[PDB]
Amino acid sequence: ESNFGVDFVIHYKVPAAERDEAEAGFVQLIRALTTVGLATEVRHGENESLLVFVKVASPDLFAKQVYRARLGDWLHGVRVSAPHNDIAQALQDEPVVEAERLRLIYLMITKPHNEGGAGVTPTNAKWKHVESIFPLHSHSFNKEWIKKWSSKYTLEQTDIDNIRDKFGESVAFYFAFLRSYFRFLVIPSAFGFGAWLLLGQFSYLYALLCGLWSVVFFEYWKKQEVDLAVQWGVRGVSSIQQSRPEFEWEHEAEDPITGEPVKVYPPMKRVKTQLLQIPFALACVVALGALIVTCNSLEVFINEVYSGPGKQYLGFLPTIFLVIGTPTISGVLMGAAEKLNAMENYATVDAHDAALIQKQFVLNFMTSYMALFFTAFVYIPFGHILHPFLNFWRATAQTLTFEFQINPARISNQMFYFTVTAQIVNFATEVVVPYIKQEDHEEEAEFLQRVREECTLEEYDVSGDYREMVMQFGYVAMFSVAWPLAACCFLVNNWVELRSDALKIAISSRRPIPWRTDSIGPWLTALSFLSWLGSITSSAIVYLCSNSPLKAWGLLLSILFAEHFYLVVQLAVRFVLSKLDSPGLQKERKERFQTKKRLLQENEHSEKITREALEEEARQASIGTPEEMFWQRQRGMQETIEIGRRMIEQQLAA
Amino acid sequence: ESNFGVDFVIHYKVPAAERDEAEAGFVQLIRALTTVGLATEVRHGENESLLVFVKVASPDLFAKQVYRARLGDWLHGVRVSAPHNDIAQALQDEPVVEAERLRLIYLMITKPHNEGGAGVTPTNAKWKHVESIFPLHSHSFNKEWIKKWSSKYTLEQTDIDNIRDKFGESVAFYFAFLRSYFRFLVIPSAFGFGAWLLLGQFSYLYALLCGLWSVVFFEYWKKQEVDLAVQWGVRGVSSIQQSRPEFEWEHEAEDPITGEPVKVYPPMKRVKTQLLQIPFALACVVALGALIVTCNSLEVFINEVYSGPGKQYLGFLPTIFLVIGTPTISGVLMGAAEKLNAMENYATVDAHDAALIQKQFVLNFMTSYMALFFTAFVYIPFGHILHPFLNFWRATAQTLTFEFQINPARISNQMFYFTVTAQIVNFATEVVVPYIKQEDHEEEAEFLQRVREECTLEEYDVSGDYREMVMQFGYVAMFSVAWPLAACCFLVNNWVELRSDALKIAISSRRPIPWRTDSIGPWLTALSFLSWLGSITSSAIVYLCSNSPLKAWGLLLSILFAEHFYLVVQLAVRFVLSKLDSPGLQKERKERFQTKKRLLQENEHSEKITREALEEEARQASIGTPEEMFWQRQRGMQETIEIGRRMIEQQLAA
């Protein structure tokens, strides 16, 4: 019921057709890991694969690897404090967590021979037989962490920090983002229930309240992430770039910024294939745009010809067919989001995911809101354009079988359907995968059985759940005025999602390779664009749905005021939160000072000043006469006093 | 025709009534300067004053003071490079400019006994007799710098950098701002002449062109000021705070950020008197607002009753009376801007001027544009409100002596009057002060005569001319669509102002005390607010003056589009100028690395890994049996190879 001290496990699938190649690749593989010091053990595997097992035998090699990497961060402004002990006295001062151990094991299996490692990245030239490298999961800790989280109402700061200790900094930021979003969701939750009782449908004051809250939360989290990165000491790691393993280069570069020549790729080949997203996004506009308008017009056509024999669940049934249908059609578009992104050669693995997301978000931006956008910005202001699409469907239904009444209250029903049915099918997909999983020395067989299962588990992507919580922010920031129970219905989800995603890392995936990132990433832009867009369409909805024919005086002012209510209250909160004097920033200017105070500690009056007058009076004697005779006029300071006093009475005589 | 090596000159006016006090103060003063090492010479003065003359005699004291201050900056991240030589080998590597010399002389006369100086700040408790401390001006360099500038068409980067060498960094930023504003003025200058020929009055395309240029200039200067601060090595000096001499404190503070206890002032007493500006600004609103409406209504009343017997110069004569009258009434309001600011106890001398300016700018914001604002936002859209003020003046003129026709083209005449007549009276005031100035050992009398004049000169404030060039940007960013020759008429001024202000430091003022500031200061906000406000009222003017009755569809869209044309092109240029890879930033990451590479240089394979297996096999022998017998199953890596190969054929047998 425990591990055997193993750090990482390499899969190395061996097929039948490339048998002699994979066998010769294996002995070349197992040679390479032994040079960098990995104590190696080979075990059996399923589908005729060979799971080799690695660990660091020599601690003083391993502590030197810790001492090398801690020196490597200290050069880049990551660590303010120097190690100062070339022998392991620095390591006894600051001990290695299990995250900092496993990364430096993973660096010794991935870094090339330039950086002192055996690079066994699978996507490079040979070893296409190595399928995956993974650390084994500790089920002993894992059972406690679920149990201790499931009994807890709230999550303390020591609960989030324990995730950093064993799962890395990038995984711990997702729970630290979620917890600080779960807590900040209660403010439009409770006020979204009070606006349901008091204010009624489409109030103006809730839109100004939500557009205030979405600034206050987002500016608070940007302050909180620079405090947490100080606390884990990962502040500034985004400034470090790490080169990509599968990055291809045409030539090496000269005149570098770091100083040593780097391998580069001419951007005219990259800006060609980056321009390929412009027809790809525009086709995906008219893919999803034609898809919504053929479901939305058909849905409004069916309530006119059947007159609703069932209830309103039957009236919106293709819209329900869209929400159960969208996580499939998001799956095919994320595949084209990743193939188009890997085709573009990106330099760093930070700037590779920094442009994956702004392709991944915009594609998810279309498929999650343009169904709602067509209700409140096409159907409500002018449904006269869809009247060709209605009678076109009337041409079929008469041949098949052998008065528009545009309701302003359609979106509040539609926002209700996008809220709960997406929350059902999400919690359906977070319950069905729990329900779809449900020789050799005769001692480690149960140990080996959990490993043989763990290769079948997929990797856990942290970005796959940021994209949900950002899209969950989009319903609250933009369209929550249509149904202010959404912030009430998201808050019950974010409690269980904080324990559902804790369960998803627990049993439905292997342990991720621990990484280091300062911020959440490029989501801080996508959380900020949704906040600003949640000022315009939060005000433009409450003007239309609360509607006299609609005047452009009314819309263009209600947009301009609330969008400039945003920019004022953005500058107020940025002013206020600058003056909160965060404890992560007080310590950083402090602890930098004592290290300089260390080097500070590393390193008569009248009688002196006459001697340089004696010095210059020798040099006029050796060789001008205005300059020397000016200064030697009053030689000592006592001579300056008496002449200074006698010039007063000389003036006082006059 | 040269100085005598003197650094600073202290005035110390001695009156008749406090004669014995000032005389006893003088001997106490001249005692204090001799302790910190100032070689002292006393000379005569006018109005029965005693000009004492100071210099540093001992160079090794003075080099240690240089070595102390260079260490002081290096602790705060100012200097990337360490001095590394406690003896003066560091100083021979990087020599002292005359600016860095005079500041450290001035620090020894101002810093208290805590920081190792004799604080002789005049505004502290005793020595109210010391009037001013000033460095003497070098007329030898000064005659060359005017002559070499007056022949030059353009100013090279070595011309601006010479100002830093003798006048400090804060003075050199004003010319570096002016030169980079003079050069960026030619873009709406030439395009403002082409819009005069082609487009005519109040074009829309020029407003989008100017609102583009005002982002491109301002974002360029913000990039350029972090390059110049790197080049002078003053980058980050704003992060250093310097305490104020005249700051009063109630008690010392505990738990500090630097570590040592500081003297503080409870903010409830300061936020009381900071709230005093709210009635002060609102009264100055209705001071200047009532002042414009009683001149503007009277001016439009005089063209109706006299029918213009003279020409249009006679028609706008109270508006001309306002522009010749405003530098006087700006003088009285700047006095209340400085008395109200000094009454508020500010901590640092940086944050003292950082709130002086936003009082000084807003007060100058009212008196320079609200005359134009009432033309284009009250008179043009609805002049029906001023009709009481007309017939009120008609009640007087009939008793004195015993049909509105609102012209849309009034502002283009009025913008012409605010352009050239302000430029006349400015160049009048920059020519009239040149035209209003036009015993003792018998050797230094001509030397002493230039000093006796120089006490009568006032100090040169750098902020007094930033406020002009920011206000000059306000006419271009906001109201240049009314008269696009303004950018043509400002460009001829900014050439001569670049040599006029070079003349004003030359003869019409003493040499300023050299300081150190990273940016221009809080003008970067006031240049940025004017840029954003130059998007709204640059579009709202061209809608009204080019005008059918005016629809709120038209105004509210023309505001919303151009103001969102601003925020898009702000984010584009911030994206583009981030990717220009400025040479001031390439060197900073470079030169930081070699200093870390210095500390980097300050600090078998298979045969090792079996020994820890031999280590653990002794410890199972001393004492678990799954963990040990797993790892000692395949002891050496060659044993891992053969079992790893035989598991393949075992699988291949199956």
Numbering used by the authors:
A (entry chain B), B (entry chain A): 15 to 416, 425 to 460, 477 to 585, 595 to 650, 665 to 684, 688 to 718
Tell me what the authors wrote about this structure, in their words.
As common for the family, nhTMEM16 is a homodimer with subunits containing a cytoplasmic domain and a transmembrane unit composed of 10 membrane-spanning segments. The lipid permeation path is defined by a structural entity termed the ‘subunit cavity’, which is located at the periphery of each subunit.
Whereas the structure in detergent displays a Ca2+-free conformation where the subunit cavity remains open to the membrane, the same region has changed its accessibility in the nanodisc sample. This movement is accompanied by a conformational change of α6 as a consequence of the repulsion of negatively charged residues in the empty Ca2+-binding site. Generally, the Ca2+-free state of nhTMEM16 in nanodiscs is very similar to equivalent structures of its close homologs afTMEM16, TMEM16K and the more distantly related scramblase TMEM16F, thus underlining that all structures represent inactive conformations of the scramblase in the absence of ligand. Here, the Ca2+-free conformation obtained in nanodiscs defines a non-conductive state of the protein, where the polar subunit cavity is shielded from the membrane by tight interactions of α4 and α6 on the extracellular part of the membrane. The protein surface of the closed subunit cavity is hydrophobic as expected for a membrane protein. In this conformation, the Ca2+-binding site is empty, with the intracellular part of α6 positioned apart from the remainder of the binding site to release the electrostatic strain induced by the large negative net-charge in this region.
